[PDB]
Amino acid sequence: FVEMVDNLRGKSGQGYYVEMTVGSPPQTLNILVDTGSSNFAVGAAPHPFLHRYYQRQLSSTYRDLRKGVYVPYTQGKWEGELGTDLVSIPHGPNVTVRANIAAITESDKFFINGSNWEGILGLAYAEIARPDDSLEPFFDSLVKQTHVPNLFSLQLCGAGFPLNQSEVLASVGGSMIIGGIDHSLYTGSLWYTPIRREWYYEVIIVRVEINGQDLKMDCKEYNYDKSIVDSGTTNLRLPKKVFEAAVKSIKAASSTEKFPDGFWLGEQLVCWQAGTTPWNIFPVISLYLMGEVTNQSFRITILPQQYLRPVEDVATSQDDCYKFAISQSSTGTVMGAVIMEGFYVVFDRARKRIGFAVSACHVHDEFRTAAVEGPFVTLDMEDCGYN
Numbered sequence: 117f118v119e120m121v122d123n124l125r126g127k128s129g130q131g132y133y134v135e136m137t138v139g140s141p142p143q144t145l146n147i148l149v150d151t152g153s154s155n156f157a158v159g160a161a162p163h164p165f166l167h168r169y170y171q172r173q174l175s176s177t178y179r180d181l182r183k184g185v186y187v188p189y190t191q192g193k194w195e196g197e198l199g200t201d202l203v204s205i206p207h208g209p210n211v212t213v214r215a216n217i218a219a220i221t222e223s224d225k226f227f228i229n230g231s232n233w234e235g236i237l238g239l240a241y242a243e244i245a246r247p248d249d250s251l252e253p254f255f256d257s258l259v260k261q262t263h264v265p266n267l268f269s270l271q272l273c274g275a276g277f278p279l280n281q282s283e284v285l286a287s288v289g290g291s292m293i294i295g296g297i298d299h300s301l302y303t304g305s306l307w308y309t310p311i312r313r314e315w316y317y318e319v320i321i322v323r324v325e326i327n328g329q330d331l332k333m334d335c336k337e338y339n340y341d342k343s344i345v346d347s348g349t350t351n352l353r354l355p356k357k358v359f360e361a362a363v364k365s366i367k368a369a370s371s372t373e374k375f376p377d378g379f380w381l382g383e384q385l386v387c388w389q390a391g392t393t394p395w396n397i398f399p400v401i402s403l404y405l406m407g408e409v410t411n412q413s414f415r416i417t418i419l420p421q422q423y424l425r426p427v428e429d430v431a432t433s434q435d436d437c438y439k440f441a442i443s444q445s446s447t448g449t450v451m452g453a454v455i456m457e458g459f460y461v462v463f464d465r466a467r468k469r470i471g472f473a474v475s476a477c478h479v480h481d482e483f484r485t486a487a488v489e490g491p492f493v494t495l496d497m498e499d500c501g502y503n
């Protein structure tokens with residue numbers, strides 16, 4: 117799998133993309149990797165923020181399905197036209213697949229200026245595909261037409277510092293291993309949690325610690341009304357109630373300095389002198405995930421290097437600046453790229469389960485490192501899922 121290594125590019129704020137080809141002759145496009153949706157979709161018409169797009173009239177292998185699709189994301193939406201075409205992944209498995217493609221004709225707050233991607237790859241399951249679950253998602257088509265194992269894995273790689281467009285261009289953003297686990301991408305052991313149901317990549321959080329201290333809520337609250345691993349979300353997003361007590365406990369640990377309320381809302385930046393960011397003063401966060409064996413459990417631990425998202429100083433100065441990447445949600449927990457950056461995340465679809473190991477890729481300091489650790493027994497653990 118050395119072919120697929122380093123095939124990703126981008127950053128958490130604007131998503132990580134892979135190079136794919138679309139149609140005959142091969143039309144090259146950068147495609148956002150999204151484990152939190154199920155639609156394969158590309159821009160098909162000129163757009164302010166697009167430097168290239170899908171041209172069906174120029175593809176001999178394109179097929180019109182004569183059907184409209186509208187996909188509303190949590191923030192952003194697009195209207196498109198259903199069709200299939202032959203699709204390949206240049207820095208992926210050497211295969212070609214006819215797969216459903218949504219040709220995006222209209223869009224609002226979807227495309228991002230200077231992001232460098234022109235499409236989205238919905239890696240999740242049919243159940244959440246639009247317009248309905250009869251639209252076979254890409255990875256399904258891929259797995260059904262080829263010999264590639266029902267398995268893919270993601271190493272999303274934060275820099276720990278801001279990237280101007282030409283740097284995101286030139287930097288390695290991580291890896292997408294289609295059909296395997298690459299052992300050079302992680303250090304330590306691989307811990308698996310079960311996928312609760314095959315719509316989103318749904319998992320169950322059993323317990324939450326801020327600097328080892330229990331948030332001590334009814335565990336159900338952590339998975340209200342679901343908890344998903346989502347490539348296409350920046351933040352770690354938590355249910356109103358969970359966010360509240362997580363932000364209270366985090367504010368507590370960080371008393372030393374005080375910050376604008378706008379910072380905690382993910383709305384205002386915060387800046388320190390170059391190299392001066394006080395990582396030690398900010399707490400670690402541990403998430404306990406239901407284990408494979410009964411009553412077993414494991415935890416993933418993230419540092420402020422993960423949940424404090426770097427952004428460029430608008431000022432001329434050399435300040436290191438950040439936005440708080442933990443935000444309120446009314447649709448459940450979303451373990452975004454911010455978390456995913458800490459780990460090598462294995463999507464073992466074949467075995468209906470998600471793996472976690474410490475990323476060779478993750479940002480840390482000298483005193484702390486991100487962790488995946490276990491097992492944990494004491495855990496009162498079954499009623500944690502929401503119905």
Ligand SMILES: CC[C@H](C)[C@@]1(NC(C)=O)CCN([C@@H](CCc2ccccc2)C(=O)N[C@@H](Cc2ccccc2)[C@H](O)CNCc2cccc(OC)c2)C1=O
Nearest residue numbers: 129130131150152153188189190191192226348349350351
């Ligand atoms: C890659 C990050 C991206 C650049 C973005 N950056 C920032 C800084 O906000 C912008 C959008 N966004 C979040 C919302 C954040 C947010 C949340 C609340 C308020 C403000 C911002 C999101 O909606 N992402 C989409 C994919 C996507 C990628 C790029 C553009 C649009 C969508 C997921 O697929 C949704 N999964 C749940 C889901 C929900 C419904 C139907 C579903 O099935 C079809 C699946 C991000 O993190």
